[PDB]
Amino acid sequence: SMRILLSNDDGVHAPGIQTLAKALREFADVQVVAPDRNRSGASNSLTLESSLRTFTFDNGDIAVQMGTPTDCVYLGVNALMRPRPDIVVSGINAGPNLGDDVIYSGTVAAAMEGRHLGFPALAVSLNGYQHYDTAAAVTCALLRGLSREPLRTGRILNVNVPDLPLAQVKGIRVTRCGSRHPADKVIPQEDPRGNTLYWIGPPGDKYDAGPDTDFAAVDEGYVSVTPLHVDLTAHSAHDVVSDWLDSVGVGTQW
């Protein structure tokens, strides 16, 4: 029987995490450790300058007060869940986590804190706000898959589910992260005293959203599965950077 640490970024009160919890609890042992509020956009932020306080609800759900998604899964794996989880599942997020958006994603960051466990961590996002049932069914299928046979490579799976009835989901695609044009919108709003305050605007239009991208798969009505890692190295740039330094004489006398 699977021991699952269930988290998210929308917080313990989100219908996405509550729907998923109910679904997982009929075949696995589930412990929720999640934020006390909506921490969308929290990325892999974590609390270093202060200790963290936990609040427990009547049903055993743990909220970490002011806790980030990373905080929650870190504490869950390393202190709060005993015996330790076999797997971390983060979701179901209200909204997609696609392309270069993933760098900002609390949903994904929560899953990343489960990267050292025996099973790949799952981040699960719904491309909308209606069909949580569909995302729950997809998640359960993946977990049953993992019970059938272990995944040998890939420590985090980023799963995006079309906001459609399950019957309309076309299948599954293994994808890579797409990307957007640079986001540049800032929305000013005056306070009552006439001071200009600034909202972060919507993202840029899709740029890389073709063959084999997560964007394209979801658009076409497929579940997108993208294996992720935490190595941020642009390996392909190595020789260019090295040659550039030599060319401009930085790091060398000659």
Residues engaged in binding Mg ion (CB under 5 A) = 9-10, 40, 93, 249
Q: Which does 6 bind (CB under 5 to 8 A by kind): Mg ion, its own copies, none?
A: none
Q: Which of 143, 158, 87, 142 is nearest to 118 (CA)?
A: 87
Residue 239 marked as a ligand binder: no
User: What is the rounded distance in angstroms from the CA atom of residue 136 to the CA atom of residue 213?
Assistant: 22
Closer to its own copies by CB, 164 or 183: give it.
Answer: 183
Residue 10 marked as a ligand binder: yes
φ, ψ dihedrals at 197, nearest 5°: -110, 160
Helices 132-148 and 15-24 meet at what angle, rounded to 10?
A: 40
Provide the token pair at 121. Answer: 């961590």
Q: Are 121 and 154 in contact (CB under 8 A)?
A: no
To the nearest whole angstrom, how small is the minimum distance from the Cβ of residue 22 to its own copies? Answer: 21
Residue 9 marked as a ligand binder: yes
Q: Which does 55 bind (CB under 5 to 8 A by kind): Mg ion, its own copies, none?
A: none
Q: Which does 18 bind (CB under 5 to 8 A by kind): its own copies, Mg ion, none?
A: none
Residue 163 marked as a ligand binder: no
Closer to Mg ion by CB, 117 or 172: give it.
Answer: 172
H/E run at residue 35: strand 29-35
Which residues make up each annotated binding site? Answer: 9-10, 40, 93
Known binding-site residue numbers for a divalent metal cation: 9-10, 40, 93
